[PDB]
Paper text:
Threefold rotational (C3) averaging focused on a single turret position produced a 2.36-Å-resolution map (flowchart S1). Turrets were found to consist of two separate proteins; a base formed of a hexamer of gp30 [turret base protein (TBP); Fig. 4], and a trimeric turret head protein (THP) gp31. The THP trimer then inserts into the TBP hexamer with a longer, 12-stranded triangular barrel, elevating the THP above the TBP. Six histidine modifications (likely phosphohistidines) are found at the hexamer-trimer interface. While all these modified histidines belong to the TBP, three directly interact with the N termini of the THP trimer via salt bridges, contributing to the stability of the interaction between the THP and TBP. Alongside three Mg2+ ions, the THP trimer includes three catalytic Zn2+ coordination sites. Analyzing the structure of the THP using DALI and National Center for Biotechnology Information (NCBI) Basic Local Alignment Search Tool (BLAST) indicated a similarity between THP and polysaccharide deacetylases from multiple species. InterProScan reports that the deacetylase-like domain encompasses residues 199 to 413, ending at the C terminus of the THP. However, a second conserved domain is also reported, corresponding to a galactose-binding domain-like superfamily (G3DSA:2.60.120.260), which spans residues 57 to 198 and makes up the second externally facing subunit of the THP.
Here, we present the near-atomic resolution structure of Haloferax tailed virus 1 (HFTV1), an archaeal virus thriving in extreme salinity. Through single-particle analysis, we obtained near-atomic resolution maps of DNA-filled and empty virions, enabling us to assemble full atomic models of the virus pre- and post-DNA release, including all structural protein components. The full atomic structure revealed that the virus has a length of 1350 Å and an icosahedral head with a diameter of ~600 Å. The tail has a length of 560 Å and terminates into a baseplate with three radiating TFs of ~190 Å in length.
Numbering used by the authors:
A (entry chain TA), B (entry chain TB), C (entry chain TC): 2 to 413
D (entry chain TH), E (entry chain TI), F (entry chain TG), G (entry chain TD), H (entry chain TF), I (entry chain TE): 2 to 115
Amino acid sequence: TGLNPDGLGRTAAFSNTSAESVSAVDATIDRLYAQDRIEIPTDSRQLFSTRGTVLRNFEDLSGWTANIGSLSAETSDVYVGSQSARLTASSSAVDIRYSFGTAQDFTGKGFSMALKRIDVSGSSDSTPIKIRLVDGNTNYRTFSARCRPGGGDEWGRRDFGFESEDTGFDVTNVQTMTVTTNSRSSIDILVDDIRVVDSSGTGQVIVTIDDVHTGDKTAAEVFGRYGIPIGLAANAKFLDQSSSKLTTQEFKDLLAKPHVYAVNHGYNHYDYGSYSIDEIEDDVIRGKYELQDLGVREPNINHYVYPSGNYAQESIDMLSNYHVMSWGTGAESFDALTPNQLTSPWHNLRCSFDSGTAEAEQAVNDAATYNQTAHIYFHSDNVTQSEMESVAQTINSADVTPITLMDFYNQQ
Amino acid sequence: TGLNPDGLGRTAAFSNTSAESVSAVDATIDRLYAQDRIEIPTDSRQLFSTRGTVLRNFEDLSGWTANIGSLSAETSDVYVGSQSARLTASSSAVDIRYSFGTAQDFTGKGFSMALKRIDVSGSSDSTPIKIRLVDGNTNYRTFSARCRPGGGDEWGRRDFGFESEDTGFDVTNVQTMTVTTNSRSSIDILVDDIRVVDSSGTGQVIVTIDDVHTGDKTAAEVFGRYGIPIGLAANAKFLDQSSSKLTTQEFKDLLAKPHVYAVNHGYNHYDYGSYSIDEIEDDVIRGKYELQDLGVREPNINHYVYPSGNYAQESIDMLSNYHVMSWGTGAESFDALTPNQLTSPWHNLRCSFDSGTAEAEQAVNDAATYNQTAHIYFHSDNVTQSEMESVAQTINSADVTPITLMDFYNQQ
Amino acid sequence: TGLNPDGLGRTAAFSNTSAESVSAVDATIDRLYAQDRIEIPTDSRQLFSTRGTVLRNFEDLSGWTANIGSLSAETSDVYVGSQSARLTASSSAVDIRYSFGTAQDFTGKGFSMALKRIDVSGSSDSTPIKIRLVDGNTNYRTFSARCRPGGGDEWGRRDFGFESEDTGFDVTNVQTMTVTTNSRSSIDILVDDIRVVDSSGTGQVIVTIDDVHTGDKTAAEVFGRYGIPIGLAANAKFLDQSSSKLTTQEFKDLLAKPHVYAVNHGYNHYDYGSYSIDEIEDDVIRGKYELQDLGVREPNINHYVYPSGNYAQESIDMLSNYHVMSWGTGAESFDALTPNQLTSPWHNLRCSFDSGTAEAEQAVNDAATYNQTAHIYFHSDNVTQSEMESVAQTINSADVTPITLMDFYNQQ
Amino acid sequence: TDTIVNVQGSFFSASASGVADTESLLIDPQDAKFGAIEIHNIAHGGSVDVELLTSSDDTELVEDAAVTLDSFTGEGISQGNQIEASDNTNTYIRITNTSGGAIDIIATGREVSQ
Amino acid sequence: TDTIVNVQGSFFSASASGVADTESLLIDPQDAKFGAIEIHNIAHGGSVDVELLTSSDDTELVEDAAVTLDSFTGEGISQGNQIEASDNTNTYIRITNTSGGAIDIIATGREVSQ
Amino acid sequence: TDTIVNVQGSFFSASASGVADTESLLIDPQDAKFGAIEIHNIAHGGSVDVELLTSSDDTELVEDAAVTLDSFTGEGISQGNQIEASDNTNTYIRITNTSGGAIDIIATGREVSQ
Amino acid sequence: TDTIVNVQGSFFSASASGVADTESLLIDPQDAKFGAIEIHNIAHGGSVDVELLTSSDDTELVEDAAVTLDSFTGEGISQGNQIEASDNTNTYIRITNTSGGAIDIIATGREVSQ
Amino acid sequence: TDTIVNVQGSFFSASASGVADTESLLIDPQDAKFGAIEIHNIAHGGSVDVELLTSSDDTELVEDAAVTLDSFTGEGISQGNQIEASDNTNTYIRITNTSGGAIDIIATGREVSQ
Amino acid sequence: TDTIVNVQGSFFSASASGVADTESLLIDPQDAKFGAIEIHNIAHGGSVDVELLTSSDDTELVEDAAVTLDSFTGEGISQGNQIEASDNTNTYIRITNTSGGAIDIIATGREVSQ
Ligand SMILES: [Mg+2]
Ligand SMILES: [Mg+2]
Ligand SMILES: [Mg+2]
Ligand SMILES: [Mg+2]
Ligand SMILES: [Mg+2]
Ligand SMILES: [Mg+2]
Ligand SMILES: [Mg+2]
Ligand SMILES: [Mg+2]
Ligand SMILES: [Mg+2]
Ligand SMILES: [Mg+2]
Ligand SMILES: [Mg+2]
Ligand SMILES: [Mg+2]
Ligand SMILES: [Mg+2]
Ligand SMILES: [Mg+2]
Ligand SMILES: [Mg+2]
Ligand SMILES: [Mg+2]
Ligand SMILES: [Mg+2]
Ligand SMILES: [Mg+2]
Ligand SMILES: [Mg+2]
Ligand SMILES: [Mg+2]
Ligand SMILES: [Mg+2]
Ligand SMILES: [Zn+2]
Ligand SMILES: [Zn+2]
Ligand SMILES: [Zn+2]
């Protein structure tokens, strides 16, 4: 045992102690048996923000022409440097254009931009925001991301997915760069810091299945037929609730398959805006420890997927204590798509094939063609087996590597 | 001190506590002094299983011809997908052939396959299993791995080492691939999921020395003459036992050299099948903490080497709580050899030069030529200084990077 | 709560405990809330030492000609192998030359060497040590590092920064290499193990600012203009001390910017040689936990910068419990410069622009040209805004990727 | 000097078998000879909430102050308590089943003087 | 030798239902028969600050020394305390509500001799 | 003032050698002079389940309430317990072998007054 | 057998309001009726050093042995001490302010026999 | 009320110098005045196994039940035990050397009443 | 029932100022009125080794058994000990300076009956 430690207050030398909860300021442990971390040491929020090189800094707006809408310097609400750009429009889109002094080559370059949504209103409270490269022949290549409430409430980086290309576009002969939105009754969005990253590596696909429906068993067989890794975005409370959900044993059996892994989706699927940050934090923590009891270990359980796709910087800040990366939701091909190098592990979306496979299959083909990572997702209750097979055959036939979220984060 | 924490049961506010053993359900620690981990957060067992792309799928056996032996669908005992392949033979080898619809280019591609041994009997209870590529001129390139009891008792991936090549083989013009075994009185082995990984990087060599013999001092000098890293697969009980073993000070002095590192081999060398899983777990845990007291720290002490090369999925499951990677034993050149990207960190072998340097030197030359990683090993009591010099000169003269196990695992 | 744990001595079953300090031999924790590590599991000291391949071995000194000074075998004080080389001179430089049997190509190769300073005296107790490559036309390319007291007191690897090149130097046609020093009254230095690493990647720049002066706010704006990452080498005691130092809120506001990160510089800037190792250890530990309270997290807080650039192997050994990497100080372009692959994360320097930007700007241009990493630094009280702007514009216009220390260490 | 052997003061227990899903064991210090109790152990055959109540009435429980002290999950023993109650201060301890099924509750401790 | 059964000394409690947002339970050792108390338990129906006060006056609280001992958050029990107060040393324990709403506070312990 | 030397109250133990695989040591407070016990130590020669039982009968064990307190694995000592039982409250402690073979069980503690 | 109710021995406290920056509360066991004390609690309104001193003089503090026991930072309570002092062994406890400003110190515990 | 000073009950110790490699200190409660003991401290000059034994014989050790309680490695003190033994229940504590060489063993504690 | 106030048993201390580098405070239970001691506190002005010794002689220390209990580094207090010694069992506690310079040692505790 020894004698009691040095100090005043209650001091004690013990042999063996058992506790439910221990709080310590300092803990000196000679040999640690604590594989199940709740709090992770890594803060991922700003690690990737400065990867690649700054293309457009917006520190001088003279090089930019407002084609439609209006452009002004923002000098108090600044992401990076002395200033950022305010993009403003009434009953119109904004389209701002930068002509390069010389032809640019953007072969295998991926695009990223800092964004804050002040106001968007009209048909929607959100817009696609597009980075759009123009060649000598006025062909466009469009990459896009979403300026939504919640995720856009504070400055955050979007990594732009390929959207569209005009036939014969020459990426070696880029003359002009364009930042543009859809038309809305009001637009007020801040941009800064367009970044270029190397994305010359092979195209990649990540598949996730949400909310632990019974159909995940047929999914595991179908994506198994091509060795495509599946992430189960798992809510541990949902296990054994009903015949429509996996049993605990079925879930453990799925995770024992070499291509199925689990990521946290909160114990009871508490989404941002529907619950307090404290309730969501408890849901996140309980999801983590319950999945750890089910045998989901470190690299896997460091990933989260936002319940209902809802998030903000508030939730990211909380989640960053527990997880390194998270994913939202979208319904179009470019939502799946990011460069192979991220600049935010928190603001990226996934493309649903719950409502038809076309956008997700388009994303997989585009990931192959334009050297990007496509993250596609579904709930297995919404998708028929022949639809899963269509997607899985699309992934097999495309020039993509299907990967885990763990692999994707370890690449950053 | 503060007042006692919230709750019923025995609650206590302390200043300073000392304990031999602490059990907690949850521990909140503001500042952690716990560099010496026993139980590691990372589960490596299935991380690498889905790397690369599936080449051969076995979901349709129509594309395969049984040249010798027999081939049938296994739909009940499936690794990946709807089915796997049963390879069966009586008093013969099995050789199954897939003809490609078009010429394949496998330059810098490494091969991996899922395997389960049901029954092998005759001359041996084990077989080499061979992936052969055959070109337009019927030249073969053979890669191989071992289907053994213990390690083959459950589904696990083998990463195939280069074995042999016919002169003038064109890897850009592969027309057929073959899965084949040696001849045995009975063969019953399941295969699934042949995977292709990129292995276009430089060739690599890992050298390990087992069982902490006194000859490790001369080894450190010899491999030191070319800056080749040595891993000591260390049993901490063996230190100071006899003149034939390193002293504790000699071992610490060896680890202070920039090219010598230690990996765990269990405190007292408890091998699978000779002891219970519980006794081996204790040996593993004690090996880890005793080596940590000797100053062996995290990336190094996350590696284990199987005592006597004995393992099964049972031991892998236990070891995965403590280690990220482990290595078995073999005596032929292809046993050293893996692609630079693994798909299992648990099922791969090392080549002995205890009984002559020829196979190990062959492996080093083949690693250089065919862009693979060779893991070679010895006990320093079995090997003369002039044999170590032969091997070390072979590594120096070959186009290989000699690397640590830490480097190799951090590449995965 | 349960019944008391197994054992003699004071055993206890608790619900909830609170403590200031907990000491345990074994701690089994089911769910760990301990993101704030003081003591890190990773020992970085010798991980990188065996990167790349040995070029020059010193195991046979016959291949070396002493042009000036003298060369002898050291067989007792050996870094690697059977021997190392003693370089000795009286009132002269040492210059030793190895002629290659065939022309070498060193395109994109970085150079590293093991070094120990026994004695240097005269104009200085230190010398530049230079690796020169010489081509068929007798053009030199010089790479250099510093042989200093403290950092040179024990065997350690230097990663050689580009210094100078003769016009028309052909790196594809290297005929001879030289190891050379400046002239001194006495030189006695040991060398071993010249290593070649691949450094063919893009050039890189790391910027650090020391000692948390108020001018870090203007620095953050200026380097922000081009999205260049700033590491603040932070002493937490200095915050709020005086108007010349950042406030705690200002510091937190700086770290909230996407391009500003913090690394440890000790709580109260205790440098080696001025204080005991124990006092410096306390400073390091306190610096770590105080910065952790300010929200600095794992990858960031695993970096240290030596106070006043002072270090020795004694300090490295202590620091290796807490940090993975540390940086010293220099005033010349080659001090900034390392290959992109290190072989020591402890012995490398940074170039000051406190006393004029010329050497740092030279380093940035050289990093771009010769595919190296430049680490440049300043105190923001010594540097005017126009000087920061000159440097930041130099970094923006050069073919370098500006990176974090975290990025740089994760590349190794 | 005088030597005396000290035997420890009066044992107290309250128990109930087969307490239904939301029912409770009411530990009443009126059942103690000394009229006050200190519960040391709660053996819980399943999940329970422990609650400390003051009554408005000297003899019956009519809830004034009530604090839910803690929740216990599953089967076990809460050893090492000092939850205290007296008749004169009208304090009651309620252990309420929360298991979703019938459980056995045994609470033990010591009588204390008022 | 003589055998004696030791029953433990006088139970003490202070309680208040529905203590308003910033109001307090003043635990006064003048209410003890022995004129000193040791509080073992604080059952807190919501967040509270616990405070130890010396009075200038022998009989009323006029604050001299005051130390805020600890803050408790939410509902529960602070078991295993030994916060001590006496009349003659004019020591008071104040448990102050901080919940943002009305709470029940029950403090229990033992009387101690002066 | 009077000085008295306090020697601690009556030692209690129950023991059994070679308890068969699923058999048990029944610790009965009827064997205590004071009719109540507090077990401090359970020395277990192999794996055991500890169980606290109330009887319907004043003198024999007919199970009413039963709670399995804890499971001990292998050989050792559960030191520092306060599991309590009395005759009048018909409380029994059962230590049941679970080892798969014969074991020695020794339980020690103190007699308490009813 | 005889039943006796044990009330715990004499409460002791020392206190000072507004102790200046480097001033101290001298806890003197001469102020105890029994001439020895055991301090259990130190409530510290700010940072303090606690120091145990032996005097050369039977009645006044003239420092012989002095050991600085521990340093407390900020406001709180050091609960669960047993720092002991007696008049006959000329032992004093000094609690010295280190806060940089005026603080309240309250120390509580028990009188012990010499 | 009556004030009494409580001095703690009879000190007990067993000791042996130079206990050979596999020899033992037999702590026998027959050596206690009250015939029962509670060992608090085991000071072990090297590695020891501690063992609790019941005898078949009232006066000599003939092993019935034996449980190896715990193993101590190297030199130190096992403080805070309550291993208990009595003459009438024929309980012995054996501390067996396991060091590979001669050691000093000192066990201290308190006599308890039977 | 009878109420008695229990004041705790006789305070014991041993102290030495300016103990030289390798010298020691010998705590001798012969100095206790009851002839046995339990040391609770060791206040150490610098590094010390604590050692428990049995003497061959009834009245003087001639080392028989000796065990080095623990080593304390720097200045502080080892609070909450129960190291025990008696005259009749010839047990001594030696606190030996190891600081490299002169230190103050204060040991406090309680007298225990033999
Ligand atoms: Mg800007
Ligand atoms: Mg298959
Ligand atoms: Mg050498
Ligand atoms: Mg009443
Ligand atoms: Mg109420
Ligand atoms: Mg009344
Ligand atoms: Mg008064
Ligand atoms: Mg005040
Ligand atoms: Mg008065
Ligand atoms: Mg009865
Ligand atoms: Mg029942
Ligand atoms: Mg009755
Ligand atoms: Mg006096
Ligand atoms: Mg002094
Ligand atoms: Mg006197
Ligand atoms: Mg007897
Ligand atoms: Mg037996
Ligand atoms: Mg008898
Ligand atoms: Mg004597
Ligand atoms: Mg001796
Ligand atoms: Mg005698
Ligand atoms: Zn969901
Ligand atoms: Zn071995
Ligand atoms: Zn500095």
